[PDB]
Design a binder for these strands. Structure first.
Lengths: 121, 81, 206, 159, 127, 97
RNA sequence: GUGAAAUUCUUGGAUUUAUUGAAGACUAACUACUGCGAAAGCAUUUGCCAAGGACGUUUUCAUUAAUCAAGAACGAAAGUUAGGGGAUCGAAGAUGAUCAGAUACCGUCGUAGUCUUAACCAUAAACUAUGCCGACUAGGGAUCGGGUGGUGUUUUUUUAAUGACCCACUCGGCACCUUACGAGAAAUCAAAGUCUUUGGGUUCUGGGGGGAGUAUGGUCGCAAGGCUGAAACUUAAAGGA
């Protein structure tokens, strides 16, 4: 086999960076396009670049595939980034839990603890 | 550690370290003024016996010798000194 | 720095008696922790029950050392955790690093999630063995959250708790921070409660 | 009939006939083998017993009390060893605990101290006030100098 | 409602025994050595001689009214191996195949508490 | 070469030891170096045990074991592929698997 | 019993099993980059017997110490001398195997010896194939033995107490990793470093390869043998990485 090659991958993997947008999976619409872009030798070589690409946009959609991002996947990570609201505020169990041996340094260090704690295994 | 006062360190680090290195050497053993219950008498015994001493004369017994420290009997106040 | 109430108030013997943090371990008391109240004749070490407010909240001025809290993290790789350290990363500063730590992430310019800190921290110093070493290196202070169990060479301060199952791993960082924030930040100064629960804080899915 | 002694066999010998019903007198005791060679592990102390003995029925019997250390329930270290002097003290205990359940005697009266493994108990409670111990057998048990027949001293063992 | 002859099997190497007796064994009955059921003379310890051999043990035990059986395995043993040869396995399964009942199984391999100096010579057996 | 910071085997403070004879070599050979293993298996095997708790007169008995240790020369230890040759570095290991 | 064999035991019922016995032999697993000894070398338990290292030490004496031709203890095993012991292994001897031969390899038996008392011998790859004293260079993280400190970890008994533990520190080990600023023919080496910038103290050894650690004398031993140690003759390489 059927086992892909560099020249090919590393020609689709360079391409896939810029042209994700023209970008497709009917691969017979890339084939044409993949000439206007690359400056390829051959007809055979060219039909094995786009074959690979279509093996990217058929799995991209399905999810986050690897070591390749194209200004479109990277802005859905500043949009997916963020989250939990409210931040940490205990009322419900108010007093925040503070080992009960957690009183000595901070009696020897501050101002206000609204604390939770283990009277003695 | 790049440095340290070894003069006076902690009190800690001595209590644990070995008798013969606290710098100036000093013993651990120390003496222990015993009322057997009967008499008031008060015999000056040592923490590490080697001898059991008798109490004063009552002929009583006191404190058996073991590896290091006596095991003293039941009666004995054993205030230290 | 003796202040006022950071001091125990009307509830700091009531809320960790349903959660266990005074407790130690089975037949195990590690020479390397003042950080065990005695030790009973029937089973088990009643961790001293007054000195964790001594080296879990050194542990809060030392930073106060962040100008920028996402450096102030939480170190991990457990199950009950990935829901408190991920999470110490959300409500304030920090890249979470539970699950992947990211080995190197502090050795060595060649990796992925990039580190160059000045006091990191560390749940289980048995699960987090590389703030004691990725520090015995070059210049990266550390702080272990030192049960009866934590090789103490080079994590220079104590942070004791209990992790034999259950909650208090996650639900203990919570206290590193609250009280780090009440030096510098944005919350409020005896009490006007604190709007979560220690019963958000537990699992996400088993 | 039972299945708790599932191991361990009885050596019996025919003393005399009748009818075709050959009666029997006790010969000796055995463990299965196997269960002896199993209970032993690597990693831990092994001990040993023995003591001969004029019963009175006037039989001469030698007994073997194998016995191990067990660990503690709660014991870092991988083990469970002994010290040695403690073992010296361990074997001497056993000697008396067995002459004593042998004078207090007979084979018949002795036998039903082997079936319900009651000597095994008596060991553990004089021993605890030392050391922990486990497994504690009697392993054997064999005859030597059994005296004259006495048909019914044996025919009184039946009805 | 059954009677019990005792087995009295053994397989080193180069031979094996199916050897029924009484349960006491001062008397004996149908004994069967390997070579007997194989004249190649080669494999005298064969996973087979044993096989057709055991079946002799339920021909001449289901002859003189041995329903059923208790069953002993012995190595060589001695100084030797204490690694049971072919035999005893094939026998222990052919004996179950021959109507026979089975009861109480256990090794007996003669173990020593040392002493008898083993053969070969220091520098060993060697090809 | 030295090979082997012990040497071969297990001996220190201890000067000289009571040797052992090989099950297999049938050589002699001190109880350090040795290389000991418990097989332990069910006398029974897998295939038959089904025809055994079948035709037994036992409504189950259990399945009694078969104890033994096993002594080896180092030669016959490799010939018979018990111990192998661990590269140089995978030596200074000490794990069952 | 084996690669596969055969010699060998087999109504005089072996091989197996049960339990007891007897004997001499050894000290399993634990048991390791760990222990102590001048080295050889030393592991079941406890009791005497005296020895010793390391620390600790606001004890002491005060240059007494370093290496050592002479000389003198110890010295694996083998082996010897005469008694005891003589299980197991097992040169020698016998054997059956394999093989063109097989006096060897493989198998089964087997004196002698292995073990001990008392006396010899003094060699070894006696190996870190690295003389000891010292003094100075560059990082670590382990461990054994001490000692010091931490309202240090458990023990819980009421708090301590110790003890195990943790960590901090150290002195003395037994090693290890990593660098190479250095050294080297290199392989590698915290010592084989501080050496053409050539020198801290001192005892042994070698000067091409063989002939040969022989012949000789001289000497220690009962003997095996050791220590001492030539030359004639021959030869352009023998060797290291």
């Amino acid at each position: 086999g059927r086992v892909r090659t560099k020249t090919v991958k590393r020609a689709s993997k360079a391409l896939i960076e810029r042209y994700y947008p023209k970008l497709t999976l009917d691969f017979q619409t890339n084939k044409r396009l993949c000439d206007e872009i690359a400056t390829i030798q051959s007809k055979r070589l060219r039909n094995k670049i786009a074959g690979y690409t279509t093996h990217l946009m058929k799995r991209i959609q399905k999810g986050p595939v690897r070591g390749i991002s194209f200004k479109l996947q990277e802005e859905e990570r500043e949009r997916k980034d963020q989250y939990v609201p409210e931040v940490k505020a205990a009322r419900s169990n108010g007093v925040l839990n503070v080992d009960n041996q957690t009183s000595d340094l901070v009696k020897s260090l501050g101002l206000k603890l609204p604390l939770s704690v283990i009277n003695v295994s | 550690v790049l440095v340290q006062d070894l003069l006076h360190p902690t009190a800690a680090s001595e209590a644990r370290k070995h008798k013969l290195k606290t710098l100036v050497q000093g013993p651990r053993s120390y003496f222990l003024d015993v009322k057997c219950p009967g008499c008031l008498n008060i015999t000056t015994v040592f923490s590490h016996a080697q001898t059991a001493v008798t109490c004063e004369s009552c002929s009583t017994i006191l404190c058996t010798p073991t590896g290091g420290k006596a095991k003293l009997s039941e009666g004995t106040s054993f205030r230290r000194k | 720095s003796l202040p006022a109430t950071f001091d125990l108030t009307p509830e700091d013997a009531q809320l960790l008696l349903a959660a266990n943090t005074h407790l130690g371990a089975r037949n195990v008391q590690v020479h390397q922790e003042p950080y065990v109240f005695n030790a009973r004749p029937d089973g088990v070490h009643v961790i001293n029950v007054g000195k964790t407010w001594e080296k879990l909240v050194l542990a809060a001025r030392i930073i106060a050392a962040i100008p920028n809290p996402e450096d102030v993290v939480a170190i991990s790789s457990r199950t009950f955790g990935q829901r408190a350290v991920l999470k110490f990363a959300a409500h304030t500063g920090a890249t979470p690093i539970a699950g992947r730590f990211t080995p190197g992430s502090f050795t060595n310019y060649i990796t992925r999630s990039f580190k160059e800190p000045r006091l990191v921290i560390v749940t289980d110093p048995r699960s987090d063995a590389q703030a004691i070493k990725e520090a015995s290196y070059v210049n990266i202070p550390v702080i272990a959250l030192t049960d009866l169990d934590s090789p103490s060479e080079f994590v220079d301060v104590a942070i004791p708790c209990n992790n034999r199952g259950k909650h208090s791993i996650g639900l203990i960082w919570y206290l590193l921070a609250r009280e780090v924030l009440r030096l510098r930040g944005a919350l409020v100064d005896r009490t006007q409660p604190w709007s979560i629960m220690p019963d958000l804080y537990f699992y996400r899915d088993p | 009939g039972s299945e708790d002694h599932s191991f361990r066999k009885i050596k019996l010998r025919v003393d005399e006939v009748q009818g075709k019903n050959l009666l029997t007198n006790f010969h000796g005791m055995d463990f299965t083998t196997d269960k002896l060679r199993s209970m032993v592990r690597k990693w831990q102390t092994l001990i040993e017993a023995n003591v001969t003995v004029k019963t009175s029925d006037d039989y001469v019997l030698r007994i073997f009390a194998i016995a191990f250390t067990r660990a503690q329930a709660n014991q870092v270290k991988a083990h469970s060893y002994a010290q040695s002097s403690h073992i010296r003290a361990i074997r001497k205990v056993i000697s008396e605990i067995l002459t004593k359940e042998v004078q207090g005697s007979t084979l018949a009266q002795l036998t039903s101290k082997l079936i319900p493994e009651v000597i095994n108990k008596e060991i553990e409670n004089a021993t605890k006030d030392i050391f922990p111990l486990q497994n504690i057998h009697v392993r054997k048990v064999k005859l030597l100098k059994q005296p004259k027949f006495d048909v019914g001293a044996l025919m009184a063992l039946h009805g | 409602s059954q009677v019990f002859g005792v087995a009295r099997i053994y397989a080193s190497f180069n031979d094996t025994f199916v050897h029924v007796t009484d349960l006491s064994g001062k008397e004996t009955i149908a004994r069967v050595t390997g070579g007997m059921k194989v004249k190649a003379d080669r494999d005298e310890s064969s996973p087979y001689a044993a096989m057709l051999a055991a079946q002799d043990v339920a021909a001449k035990c289901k002859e003189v009214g041995i329903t059923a059986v208790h069953v002993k395995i012995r190595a060589t043993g001695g100084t030797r191996t204490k690694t049971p040869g072919p035999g005893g396995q094939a026998a222990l399964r052919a004996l179950a195949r021959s109507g026979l009942r089975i009861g109480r199984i256990e090794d007996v391999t003669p173990v020593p508490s040392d002493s008898t100096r083993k053969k070969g010579g220091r520098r060993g057996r060697r090809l | 070469p030295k090979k082997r910071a012990s040497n071969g085997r297990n001996k220190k403070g201890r000067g000289h030891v009571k040797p052992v004879r090989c099950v297999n070599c049938s050589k002699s050979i001190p109880k350090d170096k040795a290389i000991k293993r418990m097989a332990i298996r069910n006398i029974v095997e897998a295939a038959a045990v089904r025809d055994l708790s079948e035709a037994s007169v036992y409504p189950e008995y259990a399945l009694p074991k078969t104890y033994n240790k096993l002594h080896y020369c180092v030669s016959c230890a490799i010939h018979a592929r018990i111990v192998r040759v661990r590269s140089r570095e995978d030596r200074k290991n000490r794990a069952p698997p």
